[PDB]
Design a protein around this ligand. Structure first.
Ligand code: A1H4M
Length: 502
């Protein structure tokens, strides 16, 4: 349901699992082992198992012989409600009917594995609030587990209770009543239906303990401890994408289909940019594949590379939102395929895009990017002209991430100073191809640097929490583990620079 992903499984295992525990229509997804950021959708069809490759090189999930997706959970939702859109080479349908659930708790935010009793009491004391909990392996009774929960209002008014969870022939229970198939089933039961202590305290399971937050100045040590890891921390974050299937109905409307670069990577309704003051003629003129991203001053608009038939809408958007800065993170063409049509005029040229006029005043080549100084106005209305600075990052490698972040960091410092130099500039527009991989990586790095720029080096940052907040505003922002490590590398490199100064 949100447990059809099996992190530490092999092909062999996945096949036996589907052959013993499933039926035709059963399915699961898993990572490939040494293959960086490949995945496999395993499916049982007519008493045999089919494996289907999914690749992510950083822009989107490409399912072989299906479509491209912003998240695996979006992929499963699409096919679990579109009977016959997934097919084999030969055009037989592959039905995804019944998720095959995984019991491994290593991806759950509350699971602290191989942790002691005393260390758990301390973390709940220093980091924990009322209702804060974790599940850890028992040391008294091996095989078993312990649920540890803070309850109350450092002076007596709170306490930590420890509940033993027995493991017995494959099932989990708290000493009586219901026996659960997974620790996740157990936790989800007792979070709905809390245990009540003999004398009446309720063991409310409200939120897991946070272990991702760090002091920015402790970055070097954390990156070193994640390098051994990163994979587990990313996997835990990925698991939480099940929570973000918000509606994308405007993007799914007939009138809007040919405005999406990829027909299933759509903006959420709740944060989509809405275009006003359009043609009365057009059937639907309010739509563009873009979302507002507000951190939780500077906001961003995340959007896809222009299509031929959306260039005019793109400039309607920039004008409406009073954006003065555009960040482009793809070449127009990579691996011989269009990623973004040229929506700006040649140097010294002037062009009309619907009701908008844009002049390219001047281009400046820098090592990692080109800057284009553009002038945007509404045709027939002088004194609406404003300067839009387009920063075009040119050297991002075709697959994977730059091996060093300094180029990226130098680029965002410059984007930041330009933005901050213009009074009431609107949101910075950021776009790549689909507008979720690079685009989210640049935005998330920008959000974190900004904190450090204001609060300096002795401030709290939380990379996965920041990514989760951004993913709640556009599907699948930050696509791959490589991008996740890069974000960390970027912030580390920013912090080192700050301290060599001082
Ligand atoms: N646990 C997980 C749930 C949903 N999607 C993904 C992608 C990698 N891990 C995942």
């Amino acid at each position: 349901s949100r447990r059809w992903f099996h992190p530490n499984i092999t092909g062999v295992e996945a096949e036996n699992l589907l052959l013993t525990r499933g039926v035709d229509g059963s399915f699961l997804a898993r990572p490939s082992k040494s293959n960086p950021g490949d995945f496999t959708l395993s499916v049982r069809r007519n008493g045999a198992v089919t494996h289907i490759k999914i690749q992510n090189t950083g822009d989107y999930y490409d399912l072989y012989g299906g479509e491209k997706f912003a998240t695996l959970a979006e992929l499963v939702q699409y096919y679990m409600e579109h009977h016959g859109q997934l097919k084999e080479k030969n055009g037989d349908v592959i039905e995804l009917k019944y998720p095959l659930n995984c019991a491994d708790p290593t991806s759950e935010r509350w699971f602290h594995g191989h942790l002691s009793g005393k260390e758990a009491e301390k973390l709940l004391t220093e980091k924990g609030k009322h209702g804060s909990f974790l599940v850890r392996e028992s040391q008294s009774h091996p095989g078993d587990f312990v649920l540890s929960v803070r309850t109350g209002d450092n002076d007596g008014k709170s306490k930590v209770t420890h509940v033993m969870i027995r493991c017995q022939e494959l099932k989990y229970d708290v000493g009586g009543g219901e026996r659960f198939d997974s620790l996740t089933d157990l936790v989800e039961h007792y979070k709905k239906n809390p245990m009540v202590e003999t004398l009446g305290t309720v063991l409310q399971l409200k939120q897991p303990l946070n272990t991702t937050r760090i002091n920015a100045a402790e970055i070097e040590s954390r990156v070193r401890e994640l390098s051994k890891g990163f994979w587990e921390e990313f996997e835990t974050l990925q698991q939480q994408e099940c929570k973000l299937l918000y509606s994308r109905k405007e993007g799914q409307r007939q009138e809007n289909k040919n405005k999406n670069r990829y027909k299933n990577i759509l903006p959420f309704d709740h944060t989509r940019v809405v275009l006003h003051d359009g043609d009365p003629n057009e059937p639907v003129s309010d739509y563009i594949n873009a979302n507002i991203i507000m951190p939780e001053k500077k906001s961003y608009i995340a959007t896809q590379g222009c299509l031929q038939n959306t260039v005019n809408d793109f400039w309607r958007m920039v004008f409406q939102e009073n954006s003065r800065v555009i960040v482009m993170t793809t070449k127009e063409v990579e691996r011989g395929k269009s990623k973004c049509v040229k929506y700006w005029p040649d140097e010294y040229a002037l062009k009309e895009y619907g009701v908008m006029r844009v002049r390219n005043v001047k281009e400046s080549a820098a090592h990692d990017y080109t800057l284009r100084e553009l002038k945007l106005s509404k045709v027939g209305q002088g004194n609406t002209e404003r300067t839009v600075w387009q920063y075009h990052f040119r050297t991002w490698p075709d697959h994977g991430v730059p091996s060093d972040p300094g180029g990226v960091l130098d680029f965002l410092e410059e984007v930041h100073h330009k933005q901050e130099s213009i009074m009431d500039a609107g949101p910075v527009v950021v776009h790549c191809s689909a507008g979720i991989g690079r685009t989210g990586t640049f935005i998330v790095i920008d959000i974190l640097i900004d904190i450090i720029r204001e609060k300096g080096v002795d401030c709290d940052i939380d990379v996965p929490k920041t990514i989760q907040m951004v993913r709640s505003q556009r599907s699948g922002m930050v696509q791959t583990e490589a991008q996740y490590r890069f974000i960390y590398m970027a912030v580390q490199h920013y912090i080192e620079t700050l301290q060599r100064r001082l």
